[PDB]
Design a protein around this nucleic acid. Structure first.
Length: 88
RNA sequence: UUUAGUUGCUGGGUAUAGACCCGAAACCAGGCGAUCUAUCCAUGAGCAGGUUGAAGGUUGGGUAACACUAACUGGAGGACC
Protein backbone atom coordinates (compact mmCIF):
# COMPACT_ATOMS: atom_id res chain seq x y z
CA UNK A 1 0.00 0.00 0.00
CA UNK A 2 1.11 3.56 -0.69
CA UNK A 3 1.92 5.78 2.27
CA UNK A 4 1.64 9.47 3.09
CA UNK A 5 5.11 10.17 1.70
CA UNK A 6 4.31 8.55 -1.65
CA UNK A 7 0.98 10.35 -1.93
CA UNK A 8 2.63 13.67 -1.09
CA UNK A 9 5.30 13.01 -3.72
CA UNK A 10 2.63 12.37 -6.37
CA UNK A 11 0.67 15.47 -5.35
CA UNK A 12 3.79 17.65 -5.43
CA UNK A 13 4.79 16.28 -8.84
CA UNK A 14 1.38 16.86 -10.44
CA UNK A 15 0.03 19.95 -8.64
CA UNK A 16 -1.11 22.90 -10.77
CA UNK A 17 -0.81 25.40 -7.90
CA UNK A 18 0.06 25.76 -4.21
CA UNK A 19 -2.03 23.52 -1.93
CA UNK A 20 -3.67 21.98 -5.01
CA UNK A 21 -5.25 18.60 -4.27
CA UNK A 22 -8.49 18.56 -6.26
CA UNK A 23 -7.26 19.11 -9.80
CA UNK A 24 -7.99 16.33 -12.32
CA UNK A 25 -4.26 15.80 -12.89
CA UNK A 26 -3.63 15.14 -9.19
CA UNK A 27 -6.71 12.94 -8.87
CA UNK A 28 -5.84 10.85 -11.93
CA UNK A 29 -2.23 10.45 -10.81
CA UNK A 30 -3.33 9.24 -7.37
CA UNK A 31 -5.85 6.80 -8.86
CA UNK A 32 -3.24 5.44 -11.29
CA UNK A 33 -0.76 4.90 -8.46
CA UNK A 34 -3.38 3.10 -6.36
CA UNK A 35 -4.49 0.84 -9.23
CA UNK A 36 -0.91 -0.08 -10.11
CA UNK A 37 -0.24 -0.87 -6.45
CA UNK A 38 -3.37 -3.05 -6.14
CA UNK A 39 -2.44 -5.11 -9.22
CA UNK A 40 0.05 -7.01 -7.07
CA UNK A 41 -2.52 -7.74 -4.37
CA UNK A 42 -5.00 -9.07 -6.90
CA UNK A 43 -2.32 -11.33 -8.35
CA UNK A 44 -1.92 -13.06 -4.98
CA UNK A 45 -5.64 -13.17 -4.06
CA UNK A 46 -7.52 -14.08 -7.22
CA UNK A 47 -10.88 -14.45 -5.48
CA UNK A 48 -11.17 -11.12 -3.61
CA UNK A 49 -14.26 -9.98 -5.49
CA UNK A 50 -15.28 -7.57 -2.74
CA UNK A 51 -12.03 -5.61 -3.12
CA UNK A 52 -12.12 -5.92 -6.91
CA UNK A 53 -15.35 -3.91 -6.75
CA UNK A 54 -13.46 -0.97 -5.23
CA UNK A 55 -10.77 -1.40 -7.86
CA UNK A 56 -13.40 -1.18 -10.61
CA UNK A 57 -14.81 1.95 -8.99
CA UNK A 58 -11.34 3.52 -9.06
CA UNK A 59 -10.98 2.66 -12.76
CA UNK A 60 -14.38 4.18 -13.57
CA UNK A 61 -13.60 7.36 -11.63
CA UNK A 62 -10.29 7.78 -13.45
CA UNK A 63 -12.00 7.32 -16.82
CA UNK A 64 -14.62 9.95 -15.98
CA UNK A 65 -11.99 12.46 -14.84
CA UNK A 66 -9.94 11.87 -18.00
CA UNK A 67 -13.01 12.45 -20.18
CA UNK A 68 -13.77 15.69 -18.33
CA UNK A 69 -10.19 16.91 -18.71
CA UNK A 70 -10.22 16.07 -22.42
CA UNK A 71 -13.44 18.04 -22.79
CA UNK A 72 -12.01 21.08 -21.01
CA UNK A 73 -8.42 21.30 -22.29
CA UNK A 74 -6.96 18.90 -24.85
CA UNK A 75 -3.30 19.80 -24.30
CA UNK A 76 -3.47 19.11 -20.56
CA UNK A 77 -5.14 15.77 -21.32
CA UNK A 78 -2.40 14.70 -23.72
CA UNK A 79 0.30 15.86 -21.31
CA UNK A 80 -1.24 13.90 -18.43
CA UNK A 81 -1.76 10.66 -20.36
CA UNK A 82 1.79 10.91 -21.70
CA UNK A 83 3.21 11.52 -18.22
CA UNK A 84 1.38 8.55 -16.67
CA UNK A 85 1.79 6.25 -19.67
CA UNK A 86 -1.93 5.63 -20.09
CA UNK A 87 -2.93 4.40 -23.54
CA UNK A 88 -6.16 6.44 -23.48
C1' U B 1 -14.84 -158.65 -10.57
C1' U B 2 -13.26 -157.47 -18.86
C1' U B 3 -8.85 -161.69 -18.38
C1' A B 4 -2.32 -158.53 -23.23
C1' G B 5 0.59 -155.37 -22.73
C1' U B 6 5.08 -152.62 -23.82
C1' U B 7 9.18 -150.44 -26.68
C1' G B 8 10.63 -148.77 -31.47
C1' C B 9 9.45 -147.04 -36.80
C1' U B 10 5.65 -144.77 -40.14
C1' G B 11 1.02 -142.18 -40.54
C1' G B 12 -3.98 -139.26 -38.85
C1' G B 13 -5.56 -135.71 -34.71
C1' U B 14 -4.72 -132.42 -30.49
C1' A B 15 -1.55 -129.07 -27.11
C1' U B 16 2.76 -125.36 -26.39
C1' A B 17 5.53 -122.62 -29.40
C1' G B 18 4.95 -117.09 -35.19
C1' A B 19 2.58 -122.85 -36.07
C1' C B 20 -0.50 -122.51 -43.57
C1' C B 21 1.39 -117.59 -46.06
C1' C B 22 0.84 -112.20 -46.79
C1' G B 23 -1.85 -107.61 -44.47
C1' A B 24 -3.34 -103.21 -40.01
C1' A B 25 -4.91 -98.60 -37.46
C1' A B 26 -2.03 -99.01 -32.84
C1' C B 27 1.01 -99.64 -27.78
C1' C B 28 6.01 -99.57 -25.32
C1' A B 29 11.71 -98.58 -24.89
C1' G B 30 16.18 -96.06 -26.41
C1' G B 31 18.14 -92.60 -29.71
C1' C B 32 18.05 -88.43 -34.03
C1' G B 33 16.09 -83.64 -35.54
C1' A B 34 14.59 -75.80 -34.54
C1' U B 35 19.86 -75.61 -41.89
C1' C B 36 11.75 -75.68 -42.94
C1' U B 37 8.62 -73.55 -39.57
C1' A B 38 6.69 -71.04 -34.21
C1' U B 39 8.44 -67.83 -30.16
C1' C B 40 12.65 -65.72 -27.87
C1' C B 41 18.17 -63.91 -27.27
C1' A B 42 22.85 -61.30 -29.19
C1' U B 43 24.95 -58.55 -33.10
C1' G B 44 24.51 -56.20 -38.03
C1' A B 45 21.52 -54.34 -42.33
C1' G B 46 17.10 -51.96 -45.19
C1' C B 47 12.90 -48.66 -46.24
C1' A B 48 12.96 -44.02 -54.18
C1' G B 49 9.81 -39.89 -54.30
C1' G B 50 5.74 -36.78 -52.85
C1' U B 51 1.78 -34.82 -49.00
C1' U B 52 -0.57 -33.27 -44.23
C1' G B 53 0.93 -29.67 -40.51
C1' A B 54 0.18 -31.89 -33.62
C1' A B 55 2.64 -30.13 -29.20
C1' G B 56 6.06 -26.23 -28.35
C1' G B 57 8.24 -21.02 -29.68
C1' U B 58 8.34 -15.61 -31.44
C1' U B 59 5.94 -11.26 -32.73
C1' G B 60 1.29 -8.26 -33.13
C1' G B 61 -3.76 -6.55 -31.74
C1' G B 62 -6.83 -6.31 -26.83
C1' U B 63 -7.93 -5.28 -21.83
C1' A B 64 -7.46 -1.49 -15.23
C1' A B 65 -4.62 -6.15 -15.62
C1' C B 66 -6.07 -11.35 -17.00
C1' A B 67 -9.00 -13.27 -20.80
C1' C B 68 -9.47 -13.30 -25.98
C1' U B 69 -7.20 -13.08 -30.79
C1' A B 70 -3.87 -13.02 -35.97
C1' A B 71 0.55 -14.06 -38.53
C1' C B 72 5.15 -16.43 -38.81
C1' U B 73 7.93 -20.50 -37.11
C1' G B 74 8.23 -25.83 -35.56
C1' G B 75 8.06 -30.93 -37.67
C1' A B 76 4.45 -35.05 -34.35
C1' G B 77 2.02 -39.73 -36.36
C1' G B 78 1.08 -48.28 -34.91
C1' A B 79 -0.68 -40.32 -40.08
C1' C B 80 -1.82 -40.03 -46.12
C1' C B 81 -0.44 -41.29 -51.75
Amino acid sequence: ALTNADRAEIIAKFARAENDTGSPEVQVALLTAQINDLQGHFKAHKHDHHSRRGLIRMVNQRRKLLDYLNGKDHERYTALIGALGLRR
